[PDB]
Amino acid sequence: MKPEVEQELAHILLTELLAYQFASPVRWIETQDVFLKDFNTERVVEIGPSPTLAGMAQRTLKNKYESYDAALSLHREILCYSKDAKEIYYTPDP
């Protein structure tokens, strides 16, 4: 694939994804299974005014992956931009 046909296909795939997104169910359960399990994400940073997504990632991390995180010694960090600014920006309180 030349990197112009691939760009065209990516454009006309993104278009359909965004066009059908608002008329299709949001599969957030399988989405956070992707980045918590397949990627083994250590820092989850939520961008937004409230910790909506961060709270529901923490709930997912207790309902599942509790034994998974302990066995693999994963230290997950769930940071919301609105409240965990010091940890996101690396400005610890002395």
Partner: protein
């Protein structure tokens, strides 16, 4: 290893992002660029709406600038292609060549209508990411995703598929599209909302087995529209959308199945709650059309949502939306290297890949003809 998740519509409060707007040069460039575009194109300031949250906002079409702004409103259209035969396009607003003003009206603040909350939320998330990026805090290979509206903000932040002016313009449009998508009849009150359902807070339930059954059987022999639209937390959070009549029915039925303890781990078990649906519909079909949702045993209403997003109701116009996106997302700005393996769409909870299998899975979920022909002639070499 970092993942960035962008939140969608929800509690959008007065003054959000304004603390960062005062201290961050990167955030200022995001807001000022969008505020200038809104003021020049539509004669209002999104910054003013965020800071002050006015109940009403009047746009005046006085002079040459006013007449240019009025023609921008007049060109705004609503297309619902494949509505039966073909297009049945209409016009967003009652603004004509003799109009001198237009008033946006709300109950307790215009930072609650989807045409203003969606650009405001997209801006505050873009400004925060731009300020994080200006401090060198964004890892190169970070994965990202967004919840409903957050998906569009995530793409503009990590992939830069649109400019700020195009992003806010195509969010304000499609914000007004949904504002007129539901038949708000008398007091701007269409009977539509969302409720968050905790299926474990009522009894033993499941993702698509027990809670989904009380929703699919209440929509297949009653003729109404109730759908599960968000799968947020397994066994603990599911969002239903549809008629504000059916949301009250669902919350009452779940309250009664909590009070009357049942264990489930035709008409015997399959149709028992079908009879329950029949008896609950009679008390429900006579309900007055307007109502206010109340917190229940398992159901908590979603404040700030009035459109049945992610349901089959908004399915007639998906191709006019598809055509609108093609004219505003330029192919030259896609930058597949910023998307492949890092972007997880809501429609497909799988990392973005330009592959035949990825196209096939999208087709197996939407039935899009362009995707089908792409698959059919995938030998694009």
């Amino acid at each position: 290893v970092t993942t960035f998740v962008f939140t969608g519509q929800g509690s959008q409060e007065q003054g959000m992002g304004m603390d960062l707007y005062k201290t961050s040069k990167a955030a200022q460039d995001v807001w000022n660029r969008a505020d200038n575009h809104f003021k020049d194109t539509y004669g209002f300031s999104i910054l003013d709406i965020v800071i002050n949250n006015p109940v009403n906002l009047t746009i005046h079409f006085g002079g040459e600038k006013g007449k240019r702004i009025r023609e921008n409103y007049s060109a705004m259209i609503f297309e619902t292609i494949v509505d039966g035969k073909l297009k049945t396009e209409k016009i967003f607003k009652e603004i004509n060549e003799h109009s001198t003003s237009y008033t946006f009206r709300s109950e307790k603040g215009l930072l609650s209508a989807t045409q203003f909350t969606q650009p405001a939320l997209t801006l505050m998330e873009k400004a925060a990411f731009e300020d994080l990026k200006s401090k060198g805090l964004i890892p190169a290979d970070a994965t990202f995703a967004g919840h409903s509206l957050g998906e569009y903000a995530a793409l503009a932040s990590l992939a830069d598929v649109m400019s700020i002016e195009s992003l806010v313009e195509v969010v304000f449009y499609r914000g007004m599209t949904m504002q007129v998508a539901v038949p708000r009849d008398e007091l701007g009150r269409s009977n539509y909302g969302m409720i968050a359902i905790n299926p474990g807070r009522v009894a033993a339930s499941f993702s698509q087995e027990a809670l989904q059954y009380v929703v699919e059987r209440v929509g297949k022999r009653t003729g109404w529209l109730v759908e599960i639209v968000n799968y947020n937390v397994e066994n603990q959070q599911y969002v239903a959308a549809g008629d504000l009549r059916a949301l009250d029915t669902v919350t009452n039925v779940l309250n009664f199945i909590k009070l009357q303890k049942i264990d489930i781990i035709l008409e015997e078990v399959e149709g028992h709650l079908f009879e329950i649906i029949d008896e609950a519909s009679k008390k429900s079909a006579v309900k007055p059309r307007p109502l206010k949702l109340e917190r229940g045993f398992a159901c908590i209403p979603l404040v700030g949502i009035s459109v049945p997003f992610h349901s089959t109701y908004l399915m007639n116009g998906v191709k006019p939306f598809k055509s609108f996106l093609k004219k505003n997302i330029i192919k030259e700005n896609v930058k597949v290297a910023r998307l492949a393996g890092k972007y997880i769409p809501n429609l497909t909870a799988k990392p973005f890949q330009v592959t035949k299998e990825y196209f096939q899975d999208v087709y197996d979920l939407t039935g899009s003809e362009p995707i089908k022909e792409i698959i059919d002639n995938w030998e694009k070499y």
